[PDB]
mmCIF file of C-alpha atoms and ligand atoms in Angstrom:
data_model
loop_
_atom_site.group_PDB
_atom_site.id
_atom_site.type_symbol
_atom_site.label_atom_id
_atom_site.label_comp_id
_atom_site.label_asym_id
_atom_site.label_seq_id
_atom_site.Cartn_x
_atom_site.Cartn_y
_atom_site.Cartn_z
ATOM 1 C CA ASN A 1 266.208 45.855 173.936
ATOM 2 C CA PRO A 2 269.329 46.740 176.005
ATOM 3 C CA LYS A 3 271.824 48.030 173.487
ATOM 4 C CA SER A 4 275.771 46.977 173.373
ATOM 5 C CA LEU A 5 278.251 48.912 174.502
ATOM 6 C CA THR A 6 281.110 48.024 172.460
ATOM 7 C CA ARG A 7 281.399 49.391 169.044
ATOM 8 C CA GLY A 8 284.059 46.952 166.827
ATOM 9 C CA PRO A 9 286.301 47.269 163.969
ATOM 10 C CA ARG A 10 284.885 47.703 160.148
ATOM 11 C CA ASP A 11 286.644 46.386 157.108
ATOM 12 C CA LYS A 12 284.893 48.629 154.450
ATOM 13 C CA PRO A 13 283.424 52.309 154.590
ATOM 14 C CA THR A 14 279.501 52.643 156.418
ATOM 15 C CA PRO A 15 277.405 52.299 153.628
ATOM 16 C CA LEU A 16 275.781 55.647 152.320
ATOM 17 C CA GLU A 17 272.379 54.512 152.910
ATOM 18 C CA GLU A 18 273.460 54.111 156.423
ATOM 19 C CA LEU A 19 275.395 56.908 156.977
ATOM 20 C CA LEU A 20 273.359 59.786 155.502
ATOM 21 C CA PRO A 21 269.993 58.958 158.273
ATOM 22 C CA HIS A 22 272.469 59.404 160.961
ATOM 23 C CA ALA A 23 274.277 62.595 160.063
ATOM 24 C CA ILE A 24 271.222 64.071 159.035
ATOM 25 C CA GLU A 25 270.172 63.235 163.126
ATOM 26 C CA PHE A 26 273.184 64.213 164.119
ATOM 27 C CA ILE A 27 272.742 67.535 162.086
ATOM 28 C CA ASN A 28 269.231 67.856 163.480
ATOM 29 C CA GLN A 29 270.615 67.834 167.000
ATOM 30 C CA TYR A 30 272.866 70.063 166.811
ATOM 31 C CA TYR A 31 270.662 72.530 165.416
ATOM 32 C CA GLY A 32 268.208 71.707 167.791
ATOM 33 C CA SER A 33 270.152 72.974 170.086
ATOM 34 C CA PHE A 34 269.111 76.221 168.595
ATOM 35 C CA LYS A 35 265.613 77.035 169.234
ATOM 36 C CA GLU A 36 263.932 78.986 166.111
ATOM 37 C CA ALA A 37 267.013 80.119 164.926
ATOM 38 C CA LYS A 38 269.233 78.979 161.883
ATOM 39 C CA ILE A 39 266.852 77.633 160.433
ATOM 40 C CA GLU A 40 268.325 78.153 156.748
ATOM 41 C CA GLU A 41 271.515 77.084 157.987
ATOM 42 C CA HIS A 42 270.309 73.825 159.273
ATOM 43 C CA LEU A 43 269.092 73.340 155.636
ATOM 44 C CA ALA A 44 272.494 74.490 153.988
ATOM 45 C CA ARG A 45 274.297 72.329 156.282
ATOM 46 C CA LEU A 46 272.168 69.224 155.374
ATOM 47 C CA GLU A 47 272.708 69.858 151.865
ATOM 48 C CA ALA A 48 276.341 69.786 152.264
ATOM 49 C CA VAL A 49 276.668 66.839 154.110
ATOM 50 C CA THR A 50 274.409 64.739 151.705
ATOM 51 C CA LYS A 51 276.707 66.284 148.827
ATOM 52 C CA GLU A 52 280.035 65.456 150.745
ATOM 53 C CA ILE A 53 278.745 62.213 152.055
ATOM 54 C CA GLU A 54 277.482 61.415 148.089
ATOM 55 C CA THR A 55 280.983 62.471 146.437
ATOM 56 C CA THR A 56 283.439 61.118 149.190
ATOM 57 C CA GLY A 57 281.212 58.496 151.087
ATOM 58 C CA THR A 58 281.662 60.061 154.201
ATOM 59 C CA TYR A 59 281.707 63.728 155.617
ATOM 60 C CA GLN A 60 283.620 66.199 157.818
ATOM 61 C CA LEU A 61 282.427 67.950 161.110
ATOM 62 C CA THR A 62 283.239 71.583 161.863
ATOM 63 C CA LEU A 63 285.180 72.170 164.979
ATOM 64 C CA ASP A 64 281.882 73.301 166.494
ATOM 65 C CA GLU A 65 279.616 70.218 165.526
ATOM 66 C CA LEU A 66 282.840 68.472 167.297
ATOM 67 C CA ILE A 67 283.183 69.973 169.851
ATOM 68 C CA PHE A 68 279.159 70.037 170.542
ATOM 69 C CA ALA A 69 279.640 65.935 170.100
ATOM 70 C CA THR A 70 282.090 65.389 172.553
ATOM 71 C CA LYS A 71 279.954 67.590 175.235
ATOM 72 C CA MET A 72 276.463 65.249 174.114
ATOM 73 C CA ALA A 73 278.567 61.957 174.360
ATOM 74 C CA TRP A 74 279.984 63.195 177.391
ATOM 75 C CA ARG A 75 276.717 64.128 178.817
ATOM 76 C CA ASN A 76 275.028 60.510 177.279
ATOM 77 C CA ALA A 77 277.897 58.812 179.472
ATOM 78 C CA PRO A 78 275.063 56.762 181.893
ATOM 79 C CA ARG A 79 278.156 55.781 184.536
ATOM 80 C CA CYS A 80 279.870 59.266 184.598
ATOM 81 C CA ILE A 81 279.182 61.242 187.574
ATOM 82 C CA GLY A 82 281.323 63.824 186.122
ATOM 83 C CA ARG A 83 278.865 64.299 183.244
ATOM 84 C CA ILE A 84 276.833 66.796 185.550
ATOM 85 C CA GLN A 85 279.225 69.565 184.493
ATOM 86 C CA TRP A 86 279.280 68.300 181.002
ATOM 87 C CA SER A 87 279.999 71.602 179.253
ATOM 88 C CA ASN A 88 283.624 72.164 181.173
ATOM 89 C CA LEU A 89 285.387 70.045 178.642
ATOM 90 C CA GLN A 90 288.572 71.466 176.343
ATOM 91 C CA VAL A 91 288.324 69.867 172.860
ATOM 92 C CA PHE A 92 291.736 69.445 170.964
ATOM 93 C CA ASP A 93 291.525 68.754 167.363
ATOM 94 C CA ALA A 94 294.340 66.008 166.268
ATOM 95 C CA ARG A 95 291.896 65.136 162.819
ATOM 96 C CA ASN A 96 294.763 66.416 160.593
ATOM 97 C CA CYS A 97 297.095 63.751 162.385
ATOM 98 C CA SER A 98 299.194 61.313 160.649
ATOM 99 C CA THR A 99 301.777 59.457 162.957
ATOM 100 C CA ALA A 100 302.349 58.023 165.706
ATOM 101 C CA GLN A 101 304.857 60.607 166.564
ATOM 102 C CA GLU A 102 302.519 63.099 165.693
ATOM 103 C CA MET A 103 299.761 61.478 168.232
ATOM 104 C CA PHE A 104 302.811 61.375 170.769
ATOM 105 C CA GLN A 105 302.949 64.865 170.623
ATOM 106 C CA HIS A 106 299.443 65.389 170.735
ATOM 107 C CA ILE A 107 299.041 63.302 173.826
ATOM 108 C CA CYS A 108 302.017 65.278 175.515
ATOM 109 C CA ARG A 109 299.966 68.390 175.022
ATOM 110 C CA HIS A 110 296.954 66.616 175.985
ATOM 111 C CA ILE A 111 298.683 65.593 179.591
ATOM 112 C CA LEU A 112 300.596 68.686 179.896
ATOM 113 C CA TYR A 113 297.118 71.003 179.768
ATOM 114 C CA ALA A 114 295.052 68.533 182.059
ATOM 115 C CA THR A 115 297.393 67.638 184.718
ATOM 116 C CA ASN A 116 298.047 71.891 184.902
ATOM 117 C CA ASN A 117 300.320 70.999 187.948
ATOM 118 C CA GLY A 118 297.535 69.725 189.841
ATOM 119 C CA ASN A 119 294.697 72.087 188.979
ATOM 120 C CA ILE A 120 292.653 68.876 186.561
ATOM 121 C CA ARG A 121 291.443 70.262 183.734
ATOM 122 C CA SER A 122 289.437 67.755 181.811
ATOM 123 C CA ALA A 123 290.280 67.423 178.215
ATOM 124 C CA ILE A 124 289.521 65.122 175.103
ATOM 125 C CA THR A 125 291.711 64.718 171.843
ATOM 126 C CA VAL A 126 290.046 64.123 168.934
ATOM 127 C CA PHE A 127 292.454 61.954 166.532
ATOM 128 C CA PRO A 128 290.991 61.028 162.880
ATOM 129 C CA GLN A 129 287.573 59.995 162.203
ATOM 130 C CA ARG A 130 287.817 56.051 160.849
ATOM 131 C CA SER A 131 287.739 55.903 156.884
ATOM 132 C CA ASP A 132 288.068 52.388 155.465
ATOM 133 C CA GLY A 133 288.499 50.933 158.949
ATOM 134 C CA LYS A 134 291.880 49.755 157.237
ATOM 135 C CA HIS A 135 293.906 53.193 158.570
ATOM 136 C CA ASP A 136 292.789 53.696 162.003
ATOM 137 C CA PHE A 137 294.273 55.566 164.616
ATOM 138 C CA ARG A 138 294.029 53.891 168.006
ATOM 139 C CA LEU A 139 295.773 53.909 171.557
ATOM 140 C CA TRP A 140 296.538 50.689 172.630
ATOM 141 C CA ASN A 141 296.555 51.842 176.378
ATOM 142 C CA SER A 142 293.533 51.921 178.556
ATOM 143 C CA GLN A 143 294.635 55.177 180.061
ATOM 144 C CA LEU A 144 296.894 57.604 178.768
ATOM 145 C CA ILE A 145 299.137 57.369 182.337
ATOM 146 C CA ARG A 146 298.687 53.903 183.359
ATOM 147 C CA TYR A 147 301.525 51.318 186.215
ATOM 148 C CA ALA A 148 302.807 47.948 184.592
ATOM 149 C CA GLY A 149 300.983 44.765 186.105
ATOM 150 C CA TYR A 150 303.555 41.744 186.449
ATOM 151 C CA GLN A 151 303.027 38.483 187.023
ATOM 152 C CA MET A 152 305.101 36.687 189.898
ATOM 153 C CA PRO A 153 306.489 32.978 190.695
ATOM 154 C CA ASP A 154 303.419 32.359 193.095
ATOM 155 C CA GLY A 155 300.890 33.922 190.999
ATOM 156 C CA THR A 156 300.933 37.235 192.746
ATOM 157 C CA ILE A 157 301.509 40.890 191.432
ATOM 158 C CA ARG A 158 303.330 43.794 191.635
ATOM 159 C CA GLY A 159 301.901 46.969 190.101
ATOM 160 C CA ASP A 160 298.528 47.516 188.468
ATOM 161 C CA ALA A 161 296.703 44.109 188.452
ATOM 162 C CA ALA A 162 294.474 45.358 185.740
ATOM 163 C CA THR A 163 297.232 46.059 182.757
ATOM 164 C CA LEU A 164 299.092 41.920 183.095
ATOM 165 C CA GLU A 165 297.845 41.435 179.221
ATOM 166 C CA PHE A 166 298.745 44.944 177.816
ATOM 167 C CA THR A 167 302.047 44.919 180.206
ATOM 168 C CA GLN A 168 303.179 41.721 178.609
ATOM 169 C CA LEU A 169 302.347 42.938 175.363
ATOM 170 C CA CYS A 170 304.766 46.412 175.737
ATOM 171 C CA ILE A 171 307.848 43.646 176.793
ATOM 172 C CA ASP A 172 306.686 41.982 173.757
ATOM 173 C CA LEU A 173 307.236 45.178 171.894
ATOM 174 C CA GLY A 174 310.586 45.801 172.816
ATOM 175 C CA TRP A 175 309.878 47.682 176.181
ATOM 176 C CA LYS A 176 312.842 47.224 178.853
ATOM 177 C CA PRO A 177 310.628 46.143 182.414
ATOM 178 C CA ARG A 178 311.961 47.440 185.633
ATOM 179 C CA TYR A 179 309.985 45.703 188.130
ATOM 180 C CA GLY A 180 308.557 47.829 190.064
ATOM 181 C CA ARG A 181 305.058 48.757 191.979
ATOM 182 C CA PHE A 182 305.259 51.808 190.493
ATOM 183 C CA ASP A 183 306.088 51.928 186.683
ATOM 184 C CA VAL A 184 304.465 54.258 184.003
ATOM 185 C CA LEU A 185 303.765 52.197 180.861
ATOM 186 C CA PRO A 186 304.750 53.678 177.641
ATOM 187 C CA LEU A 187 302.499 55.211 175.120
ATOM 188 C CA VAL A 188 301.664 52.063 172.311
ATOM 189 C CA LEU A 189 300.448 54.103 169.341
ATOM 190 C CA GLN A 190 298.826 53.135 166.270
ATOM 191 C CA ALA A 191 298.599 55.314 163.531
ATOM 192 C CA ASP A 192 296.836 55.141 159.988
ATOM 193 C CA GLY A 193 296.301 51.217 161.035
ATOM 194 C CA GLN A 194 299.953 50.612 161.104
ATOM 195 C CA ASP A 195 301.661 48.630 163.816
ATOM 196 C CA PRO A 196 301.769 50.578 167.118
ATOM 197 C CA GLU A 197 305.054 52.378 168.014
ATOM 198 C CA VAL A 198 306.253 52.657 171.358
ATOM 199 C CA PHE A 199 306.751 55.642 173.352
ATOM 200 C CA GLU A 200 308.358 56.272 177.185
ATOM 201 C CA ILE A 201 305.943 59.397 178.058
ATOM 202 C CA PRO A 202 308.244 61.940 179.737
ATOM 203 C CA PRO A 203 308.409 61.798 183.445
ATOM 204 C CA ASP A 204 307.976 65.451 184.183
ATOM 205 C CA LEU A 205 304.627 64.787 182.850
ATOM 206 C CA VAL A 206 303.513 62.166 185.126
ATOM 207 C CA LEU A 207 302.535 63.701 188.111
ATOM 208 C CA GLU A 208 301.830 61.574 191.107
ATOM 209 C CA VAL A 209 300.595 61.880 194.826
ATOM 210 C CA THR A 210 302.473 60.685 197.868
ATOM 211 C CA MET A 211 300.075 58.372 199.862
ATOM 212 C CA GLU A 221 306.783 52.929 204.668
ATOM 213 C CA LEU A 222 303.117 52.709 204.489
ATOM 214 C CA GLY A 223 304.503 52.476 200.466
ATOM 215 C CA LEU A 224 302.399 54.228 197.963
ATOM 216 C CA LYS A 225 302.113 56.955 194.738
ATOM 217 C CA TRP A 226 299.244 57.472 192.280
ATOM 218 C CA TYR A 227 299.147 59.426 189.031
ATOM 219 C CA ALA A 228 297.238 62.241 189.466
ATOM 220 C CA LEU A 229 295.429 62.518 185.732
ATOM 221 C CA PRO A 230 292.324 59.240 185.206
ATOM 222 C CA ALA A 231 292.742 59.429 181.433
ATOM 223 C CA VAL A 232 290.665 57.284 179.574
ATOM 224 C CA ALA A 233 292.412 56.319 176.333
ATOM 225 C CA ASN A 234 290.543 53.429 174.680
ATOM 226 C CA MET A 235 287.037 54.247 173.896
ATOM 227 C CA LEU A 236 285.463 55.120 170.556
ATOM 228 C CA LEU A 237 283.327 58.280 169.860
ATOM 229 C CA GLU A 238 280.597 58.199 168.021
ATOM 230 C CA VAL A 239 279.041 61.104 166.185
ATOM 231 C CA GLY A 240 276.327 61.295 163.211
ATOM 232 C CA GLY A 241 277.459 57.607 161.850
ATOM 233 C CA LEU A 242 280.733 58.812 162.161
ATOM 234 C CA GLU A 243 283.423 56.896 164.403
ATOM 235 C CA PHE A 244 286.431 57.918 166.152
ATOM 236 C CA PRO A 245 288.767 55.111 167.557
ATOM 237 C CA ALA A 246 291.482 57.432 168.965
ATOM 238 C CA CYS A 247 289.816 60.492 171.736
ATOM 239 C CA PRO A 248 291.425 59.654 175.051
ATOM 240 C CA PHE A 249 289.499 61.861 177.418
ATOM 241 C CA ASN A 250 290.503 62.829 181.060
ATOM 242 C CA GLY A 251 288.774 64.521 184.082
ATOM 243 C CA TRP A 252 289.507 63.840 187.549
ATOM 244 C CA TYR A 253 289.554 61.047 190.351
ATOM 245 C CA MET A 254 286.793 60.867 192.705
ATOM 246 C CA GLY A 255 288.891 59.642 195.301
ATOM 247 C CA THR A 256 287.059 56.222 196.367
ATOM 248 C CA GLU A 257 288.297 54.113 193.240
ATOM 249 C CA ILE A 258 292.036 54.633 193.025
ATOM 250 C CA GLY A 259 293.035 51.195 191.800
ATOM 251 C CA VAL A 260 295.462 50.193 194.528
ATOM 252 C CA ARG A 261 295.035 46.481 193.793
ATOM 253 C CA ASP A 262 298.247 46.266 194.625
ATOM 254 C CA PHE A 263 297.698 44.221 197.334
ATOM 255 C CA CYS A 264 298.296 42.129 200.347
ATOM 256 C CA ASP A 265 297.243 45.656 202.094
ATOM 257 C CA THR A 266 294.699 44.125 204.948
ATOM 258 C CA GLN A 267 297.888 45.490 207.110
ATOM 259 C CA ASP A 292 282.644 46.996 213.070
ATOM 260 C CA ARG A 293 282.012 44.260 210.793
ATOM 261 C CA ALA A 294 284.749 43.381 207.987
ATOM 262 C CA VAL A 295 284.893 45.263 204.771
ATOM 263 C CA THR A 296 285.989 48.636 206.421
ATOM 264 C CA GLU A 297 289.221 48.931 204.011
ATOM 265 C CA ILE A 298 288.508 52.687 203.289
ATOM 266 C CA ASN A 299 289.531 55.575 200.857
ATOM 267 C CA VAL A 300 290.939 58.380 203.778
ATOM 268 C CA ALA A 301 294.514 58.776 203.343
ATOM 269 C CA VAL A 302 293.759 59.417 199.279
ATOM 270 C CA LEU A 303 291.128 62.203 199.783
ATOM 271 C CA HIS A 304 293.333 64.074 202.286
ATOM 272 C CA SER A 305 296.936 63.382 200.708
ATOM 273 C CA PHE A 306 295.453 64.610 197.087
ATOM 274 C CA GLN A 307 294.166 67.570 198.555
ATOM 275 C CA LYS A 308 297.020 68.523 200.782
ATOM 276 C CA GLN A 309 299.151 68.195 197.335
ATOM 277 C CA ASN A 310 296.355 70.647 195.721
ATOM 278 C CA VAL A 311 295.660 67.940 193.309
ATOM 279 C CA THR A 312 291.752 68.340 191.986
ATOM 280 C CA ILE A 313 289.785 65.186 193.417
ATOM 281 C CA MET A 314 285.659 64.601 193.334
ATOM 282 C CA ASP A 315 285.369 66.588 197.014
ATOM 283 C CA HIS A 316 282.253 68.286 197.711
ATOM 284 C CA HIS A 317 283.874 71.652 196.842
ATOM 285 C CA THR A 318 285.104 70.751 193.886
ATOM 286 C CA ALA A 319 281.331 69.070 192.661
ATOM 287 C CA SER A 320 279.813 72.302 193.891
ATOM 288 C CA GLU A 321 282.532 74.452 192.326
ATOM 289 C CA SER A 322 282.587 72.427 188.657
ATOM 290 C CA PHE A 323 278.745 72.543 188.770
ATOM 291 C CA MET A 324 278.611 76.282 189.043
ATOM 292 C CA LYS A 325 281.105 76.773 186.325
ATOM 293 C CA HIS A 326 278.971 74.509 184.237
ATOM 294 C CA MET A 327 276.014 76.686 185.016
ATOM 295 C CA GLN A 328 277.689 79.598 183.899
ATOM 296 C CA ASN A 329 278.431 78.548 180.627
ATOM 297 C CA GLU A 330 274.257 78.357 180.412
ATOM 298 C CA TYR A 331 273.876 81.867 180.392
ATOM 299 C CA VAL A 364 270.340 54.256 170.249
ATOM 300 C CA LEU A 365 272.071 57.103 172.265
ATOM 301 C CA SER A 366 274.007 59.894 169.828
ATOM 302 C CA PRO A 367 276.821 60.833 170.112
ATOM 303 C CA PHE A 368 277.978 58.425 172.578
ATOM 304 C CA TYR A 369 281.447 56.756 173.764
ATOM 305 C CA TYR A 370 281.730 53.287 173.043
ATOM 306 C CA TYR A 371 284.236 50.436 174.261
ATOM 307 C CA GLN A 372 286.187 48.557 171.523
ATOM 308 C CA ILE A 373 288.021 45.099 171.402
ATOM 309 C CA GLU A 374 291.309 45.433 172.571
ATOM 310 C CA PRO A 375 293.503 46.008 169.516
ATOM 311 C CA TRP A 376 296.169 43.244 169.937
ATOM 312 C CA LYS A 377 293.138 40.830 169.453
ATOM 313 C CA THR A 378 292.187 42.222 166.213
ATOM 314 C CA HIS A 379 295.284 44.129 164.494
ATOM 315 C CA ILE A 380 296.503 42.605 161.494
ATOM 316 C CA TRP A 381 300.295 42.742 161.561
ATOM 317 C CA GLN A 382 302.201 44.169 159.025
ATOM 318 C CA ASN A 383 306.003 43.116 160.100
ATOM 319 C CA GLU A 384 307.446 45.465 163.012
ATOM 320 C CA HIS A 385 308.134 44.734 166.810
ATOM 321 C CA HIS A 386 308.616 40.816 167.014
ATOM 322 C CA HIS A 387 306.393 38.233 169.477
ATOM 323 C CA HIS A 388 303.382 40.525 168.931
HETATM 324 C C1 LIG B 401 284.972 65.786 186.027
HETATM 325 C C2 LIG B 401 285.721 64.755 186.342
HETATM 326 C C3 LIG B 401 284.884 63.204 186.285
HETATM 327 C C4 LIG B 401 284.632 62.430 186.631
HETATM 328 C C5 LIG B 401 285.000 62.193 188.412
HETATM 329 C C6 LIG B 401 283.884 61.348 186.064
HETATM 330 C C7 LIG B 401 283.483 60.525 186.421
HETATM 331 C C8 LIG B 401 283.151 59.060 186.337
HETATM 332 C C9 LIG B 401 283.043 58.144 187.237
HETATM 333 C C10 LIG B 401 283.196 57.717 188.415
HETATM 334 C C11 LIG B 401 283.294 56.947 186.120
HETATM 335 C C12 LIG B 401 282.350 55.291 186.823
HETATM 336 C C13 LIG B 401 283.792 54.327 186.829
HETATM 337 C C14 LIG B 401 284.757 54.596 185.476
HETATM 338 O O1 LIG B 401 284.233 53.899 184.880
HETATM 339 O O2 LIG B 401 285.552 54.836 185.630
HETATM 340 C C15 LIG B 401 283.180 57.651 184.986
HETATM 341 C C16 LIG B 401 282.719 56.864 183.584
HETATM 342 C C17 LIG B 401 283.092 57.153 182.568
HETATM 343 N N1 LIG B 401 283.498 58.580 182.252
HETATM 344 FE FE1 LIG B 401 283.816 59.886 183.771
HETATM 345 N N2 LIG B 401 284.188 61.493 184.893
HETATM 346 C C18 LIG B 401 284.824 62.476 184.439
HETATM 347 C C19 LIG B 401 284.683 63.377 183.009
HETATM 348 C C20 LIG B 401 284.746 62.610 182.185
HETATM 349 C C21 LIG B 401 284.970 63.315 180.662
HETATM 350 C C22 LIG B 401 285.715 64.817 180.387
HETATM 351 C C23 LIG B 401 284.586 62.599 180.138
HETATM 352 C C24 LIG B 401 284.501 62.224 178.460
HETATM 353 C C25 LIG B 401 284.552 63.690 177.351
HETATM 354 C C26 LIG B 401 283.967 61.327 180.966
HETATM 355 C C27 LIG B 401 283.579 59.752 180.251
HETATM 356 C C28 LIG B 401 283.173 58.663 180.718
HETATM 357 C C29 LIG B 401 282.770 57.416 180.408
HETATM 358 C C30 LIG B 401 282.978 57.389 178.760
HETATM 359 C C31 LIG B 401 282.656 56.729 181.084
HETATM 360 C C32 LIG B 401 282.305 55.250 180.972
HETATM 361 C C33 LIG B 401 281.794 54.282 181.689
HETATM 362 C C34 LIG B 401 280.023 55.157 181.056
HETATM 363 O O3 LIG B 401 280.101 56.081 180.219
HETATM 364 O O4 LIG B 401 279.292 54.405 181.471
HETATM 365 N N3 LIG B 401 284.161 61.544 181.636
HETATM 366 N N4 LIG B 401 283.328 58.901 185.202
#
C-alpha cells in the first residue's frame, strides 16, 4: 500500500468521473475546518464546483481554498520538520500568469519577500494549474537559488555536485558559464507548455552567508520543482521556501576533510548564520515560530509531489539549440 511520491505529466484533461470525487472531498476538508458552521455555504460551493466541472471540464479554487490547500499540503509533508508551524505561510497567487517573463517577476517578488534581508519568511507562489497537460508551467530548477556544478577532467566537482545535469542544460540553453565554486544558476522558466527561457537572477536578490577557509552559501532554501495537488487539481509550478536547519547546507563542494571518524560537524554554519542575522532553525527560531503558529490558532490530499525532471519529458518546439 505505500503510495508513489511522484506525480507525472498528462496529455489530456483529468476526466470528470475522476475529478469530481476529489473536488467534492477537498471542499469537505475545507468546510470541515468549520465545525457545525457554514453548512449552507458548503452545499452552495459543491453545486458551484460541480456545475463548473461539468461545463468547463475543471474548476477554480477560491483564494481562501488555495491558501488552506498550500498549508494543508505543507502539514501533510511527512519529512518536513518545519510543518510544525504550517500556519506561518505567505501565499502569492500567480494563477493568472501567462508568460515566462511574468513568472520571472513573480519569482523576484518571492525571493525578495522571503529573504527579507535575512529575517526569512516562508512563502509559496502558485502559478496556473495544469489544464490539458500540454500547457504546463514549470520551473526547471530544483531550487530558486542554487550553485552551478561543473564537471572536471579528473572526474571531480567544482560547484554544487547535485546540479551537474541542470548546469549542463543551462549551458546548452545559451547560458555563459563562469567556472567558480559559487555561481548562482539562472532561472529556467517554462510558461504555458512552451520551451523554457533563461533568466539571470539579479545579484542583489541573492543573500549569501560567508562561512581562506573559502566558503559561502545562499540564505534562502527554496524548492522550485514540486507539484501541488488539491481536490484533483494539479499545480506543476509552485515554488516555496522555508529556512535552513543548519545541518544540511550541502557543502558537497569537497576535499573538505581539511573520537571515531565521521566527525565532520556543522558548527561554523550555525554561528555564521546567527552572526549575520539570517534565520536558521536553531532552538530560538523553533520556539518562536511555534509560538507564532499557536497564536494564529486563537491518499493524502492536498499534497506536494515530486515530478519527472522536465528536460526528460519536454516536447521541444524549436528554440535554444543543443537542448
Ligand atoms: C520554515 C522552515 C522550514 C524548515 C526548517 C523545513 C525543513 C524541512 C526539512 C529538514 C526537510 C527534509 C529535507 C529536505 O527535503 O530538504 C523538508 C522537506 C520538505 N519541506 Fe520543508 N521546511 C520548511 C518550510 C517548508 C514550507 C514553507 C513548505 C511548503 C509550503 C515545505 C515543504 C516541504 C516539502 C514538500 C518537503 C519535501 C519532503 C517531504 O515532504 O517529505 N517546507 N523541509
